[PDB]
């Protein structure tokens, strides 16, 4: 049982790649060499009062950690850049999520900029019955009350279904 020592040793920490995802069960199968695992858990960003979900992709690289080389109970740590998921940025001053559809969410502390960028689609901020929606063709604000505090300038036309009440002058140009 001395070869078992180096066996367990070698099996404790394994470089591996995702080959299968059981989404409903939240498990992955990984491959290290010509060995394929059973259904194993991956470490997510949070699994408590807060939970995060981001299933590892097939082809994603990481490391499997198995207590005493008990590989049937190993857990997977993804996030190794590779052909299935390359480094999405190269800046010393940025924290960036990039998605397959070209979307990205990034903070840059050199430029002091938070950027939510979608080539197409919708960004939605909803709290109860209130909503800010940014889409390809519109920005919409919906609420029981819409309050604009400050000088407002409209570069365009304005159409109002209900009454318009002004506390000052109302002056046209035509």
Contacts to Ca ion by CB under 5 A: 5
User: With CB under 5 A as the contact rule, which of the stretches 65-73, 78-86, 131-139, 141-149 interacts with Cl ion?
Assistant: 78-86
The 114-133 site mask, x for binding its own copies (CB under 8 A), equals xxxxxxxxxxxxxxxxxxx-
The residue within the footprint of Cl ion, chosen from 39, 53, 81, 97 (CB under 5 A), is: 81
Minimum Å gap between C-beta 1 and Ca ion is 9
| Residue 19 vs 118, nearer CB to Cl ion | 19
Q: What are the residues whose beta carbons fall under 8 Å from the beta carbon of 55, sequence distance 6 or more? A: 21, 23, 26, 28
User: With CB under 5 A as the contact rule, which of the stretches 24-32, 111-119, 131-139, 160-168 interacts with Cl ion?
Assistant: 24-32
Q: What are the residues whose beta carbons fall under 8 Å from the beta carbon of 96, sequence distance 6 or more? A: 88, 89, 104, 105, 106, 107
The residue within the footprint of Cl ion, chosen from 12, 26, 84, 132 (CB under 5 A), is: 26
**Residues β-bridged to residue 95:** 107
Q: CA–CA separation, 170 vs 67, rounded Å?
A: 76
Site for Cl ion in 29-48 (CB under 5 A): 41
The reply on whether position 36 binds its own copies by CB under 8 A is no
Q: CA–CA separation, 104 vs 57, rounded Å?
A: 18
Which has the closest alpha carbon to 89: 115, 60, 124, 64?
Answer: 115
Sites of contact with Cl ion (CB under 5 A): 26, 41, 81
């Amino acid at each position: 049982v001395s070869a078992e020592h180096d066996r367990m040793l070698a099996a404790m920490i394994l470089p591996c790649v995702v080959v299968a995802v059981d989404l409903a069960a939240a498990r992955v199968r990984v491959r290290s060499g010509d060995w394929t695992s059973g259904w194993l858990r991956w470490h997510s960003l949070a699994a408590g009062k807060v939970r995060h979900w981001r299933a590892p992709s097939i082809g994603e690289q990481g490391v499997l950690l198995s207590p005493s080389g008990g590989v049937s109970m190993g857990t997977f740590i993804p996030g190794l850049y590779g052909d299935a998921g390359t480094a999405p940025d190269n800046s010393a001053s940025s924290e960036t999520w990039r998605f397959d559809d070209g979307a990205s969410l990034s903070y840059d502390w050199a430029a002091h900029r938070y950027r939510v960028e979608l080539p197409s689609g919708t960004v939605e901020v909803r709290v109860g019955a209130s909503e800010v929606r940014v889409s390809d063709g519109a920005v919409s604000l919906k609420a029981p009350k819409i309050s604009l505090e400050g000088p407002v300038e409209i570069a365009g036309t304005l159409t109002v279904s209900g009454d318009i009440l002004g506390g000052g002058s109302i002056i046209d140009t035509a």
